[PDB]
Design a protein around this ligand. Sequence first.
Ligand SMILES: [Mg+2]
Ligand SMILES: [Mg+2]
Ligand SMILES: [Mg+2]
Ligand SMILES: [Mg+2]
Ligand SMILES: [Mg+2]
Ligand SMILES: [Mg+2]
Ligand SMILES: [Mg+2]
Ligand SMILES: [Mg+2]
Ligand SMILES: [Mg+2]
Ligand SMILES: [Mg+2]
Ligand SMILES: [Mg+2]
Ligand SMILES: [Mg+2]
Ligand SMILES: [Mg+2]
Ligand SMILES: [Mg+2]
Ligand SMILES: [Mg+2]
Ligand SMILES: [Mg+2]
Ligand SMILES: [Mg+2]
Ligand SMILES: [Mg+2]
Ligand SMILES: [Mg+2]
Lengths: 175, 49, 126, 52, 60
Amino acid sequence: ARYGATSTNPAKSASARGSYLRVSFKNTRETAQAINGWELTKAQKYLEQVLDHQRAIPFRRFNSSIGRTAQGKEFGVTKARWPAKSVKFVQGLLQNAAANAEAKGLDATKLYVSHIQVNQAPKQRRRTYRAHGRINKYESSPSHIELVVTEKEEKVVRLTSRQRGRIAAQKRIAA
Amino acid sequence: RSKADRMAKMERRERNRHAKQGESDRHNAVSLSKHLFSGKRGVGKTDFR
Amino acid sequence: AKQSLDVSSDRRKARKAYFTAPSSQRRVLLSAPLSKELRAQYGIKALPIRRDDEVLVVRGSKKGQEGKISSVYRLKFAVQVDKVTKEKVNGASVPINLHPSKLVITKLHLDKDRKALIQRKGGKLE
Amino acid sequence: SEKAGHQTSAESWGTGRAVARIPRVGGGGTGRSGQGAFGNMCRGGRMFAPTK
Amino acid sequence: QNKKNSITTRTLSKKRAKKIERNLKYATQRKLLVSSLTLVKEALWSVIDQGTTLGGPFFP
RNA sequence: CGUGGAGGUCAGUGACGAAGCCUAGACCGUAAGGUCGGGUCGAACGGCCUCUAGUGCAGAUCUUGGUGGUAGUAGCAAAUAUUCAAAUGAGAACUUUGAAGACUGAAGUGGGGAAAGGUUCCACGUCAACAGCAGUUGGACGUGGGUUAGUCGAUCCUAAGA
RNA sequence: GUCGAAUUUGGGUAUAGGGGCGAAAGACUAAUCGAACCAUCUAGUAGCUGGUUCCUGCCGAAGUUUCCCUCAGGAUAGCAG
RNA sequence: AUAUUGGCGAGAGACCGAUAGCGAACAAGUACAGUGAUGGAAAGAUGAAAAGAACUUUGAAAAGAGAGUGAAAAAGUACGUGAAAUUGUUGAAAGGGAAGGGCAUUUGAUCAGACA
Ligand SMILES: [Mg+2]
Ligand SMILES: [Mg+2]
Ligand SMILES: [Mg+2]
Ligand SMILES: [Mg+2]
Ligand SMILES: [Mg+2]
Ligand SMILES: [Mg+2]
Ligand SMILES: [Mg+2]
Ligand SMILES: [Mg+2]
Ligand SMILES: [Mg+2]
Ligand SMILES: [Mg+2]
Ligand SMILES: [Mg+2]
Ligand SMILES: [Mg+2]
Ligand SMILES: [Mg+2]
Ligand SMILES: [Mg+2]
Ligand SMILES: [Mg+2]
Ligand SMILES: [Mg+2]
Ligand SMILES: [Mg+2]
Ligand SMILES: [Mg+2]
Ligand SMILES: [Mg+2]
């Protein structure tokens, strides 16, 4: 419980979440933002194509010194990648949300990703020995992911007496 | 037995997040190293290359 | 107010003694009052609780229920009554932890030592 | 206690060490090694003008 | 709105809803002034609470 | 003006919600600050007359703890080198078997020991953490098994010495 | 560079800090040697550097005089209450 | 008659309240470091009661979604409250080589008083 945002009329929505997942927060945020707002089946097929390296995930925020590719022209960018681990985690959550919607009885053809949110989980703190007998940090940045899918469904004016008189005079003068 | 197993698995989580080799891994790091913070480098012998 | 120099009003000392009290002291600490009928019959007001006496619950969500003391869990400062429990769907029954100051003894388990205790407290049994 | 904050083996590392000149605990193998000591502004140090 | 009967961040907790119902009962009073296991165990307690001659004088 | 504790008083506030915290709301002070509404919270707290002090922080390369940008960046390029099929498994560049290609080249990447370590040896089970990728594998995790002397050593003798 | 001896090396043993040891470089004596390491006296010594925590109102200065031989460190006069 | 930071047994405080108070409120002179003499931490709080989430379903599994226990899961052994730094999502706004501040007003949003 306690999602970042919930749906009004929860009888038309299904939710899924995953916590403390050992996967890169920045890549996962990019993947979730690529998925944000799509139809569920279209999003799943797109993620399959990303795994097949036919399409790409555009990297918009965490993208310094990234290579450029022609597969970013679909989304009007130059920097895009294919994060397989993040795609697999998001695919698992999508499948779970679809299963929950099916158990609730919602129409699978009308489901769209109405909410998806990735934030930072507590860090996994390994350490590495380095030159001159130093200890440097060597950390994993895990993610909390959550998503909500949703079924798609298809003045007194106060006037002055002068204004009232003007309106009445116009009414008398006209038809 | 399963309740005890779940209790142990819940107990392990902080050490696993700190990436310990196990319950026997109790390495301690100092706050600051004097050999790294004890330097005035004159024209002569140094402590490292 | 206290007058003796050998008694302490220190909250820390009192709580430490209570929580570290050994089993023989916890027996006296787990004392339950008698019913009106037993009070009139014997002439005493309260006794330490034991295993084979009947009780009535007079406080809490289980008020009005009766039963026999199933056990005296001195380790957790509680008593367990066979009739008073909590039930689950899977058939699980968990005993309710009751405090003897919230109970009333309706039928004492009588033996030689219990009779002697009542008599030395000032009772008039039979 | 008159010994509070004083039961520590510590010394300053000197000027020019890129760290503050507060005395620091020696030794090794514990998180205490290298921490500031003896100061009224230090965690675990001696309070200013201890009550008598 | 729930009594009358997209994505939102406005939620009502059960604790607050229960307190609201309790306080509404207080205000209404002022305005007026001015288990299967248990069943099975009960049933079990309610339900528990010449001749013949074979052979003869011989060793078969 | 504000803070911790203390004597007195308001027969002060409080489970119909104390303290704390958040706040696109309201008000009073020149100001230090004070007051009210809403949300959260779940048991204590304030006004005034006085007493008392470990009583007010932006800085001290201040102390302890926590967190950023750098940045998915630098990099994971010494030691010539890996490939195919099957099996297992949710999942195999990295595990097992087989099929191949190579290397150490007897001053070895072979076979034993001394110092040191102390169960790491071996079997069964087994992947949360660790093995800077991975992992079904492991010197990892869990449970056990294993070291047999009249003849090998110590033990005895003396050396420099104590 | 040297490579059969002023050779290389294991173990045992001896020498301990105002001391040792030194084919002598203030070399080495457990990453420490112009003085090993540990604890205490000890909150050692300040000519000096850095910092020093709420508000408002009113008043509000000082490099100019004589001196301890002159530096240093102090006295005194003036200015503000 | 006087002394008493050790030992044993007691009673108290205008003392401190988990970075404070003894180094140590907790398996603390412990863990760990050092050849050694010695040096020496961090670490308290679910709930009244473990009643610590049975059962269905998705998933290899961790877990998720329904359901349930409980006053409360805006208490799920990461557990009273749950600030800031820093972050995600949503809504609104601005942006031709910084941003922030002062005076004044326009615009958009939003709001109190006063209503006899
Ligand atoms: Mg580059
Ligand atoms: Mg090293
Ligand atoms: Mg202290
Ligand atoms: Mg309140
Ligand atoms: Mg102070
Ligand atoms: Mg500060
Ligand atoms: Mg300042
Ligand atoms: Mg600083
Ligand atoms: Mg690179
Ligand atoms: Mg190589
Ligand atoms: Mg070769
Ligand atoms: Mg060869
Ligand atoms: Mg790895
Ligand atoms: Mg092995
Ligand atoms: Mg083993
Ligand atoms: Mg040396
Ligand atoms: Mg402490
Ligand atoms: Mg909490
Ligand atoms: Mg914030």
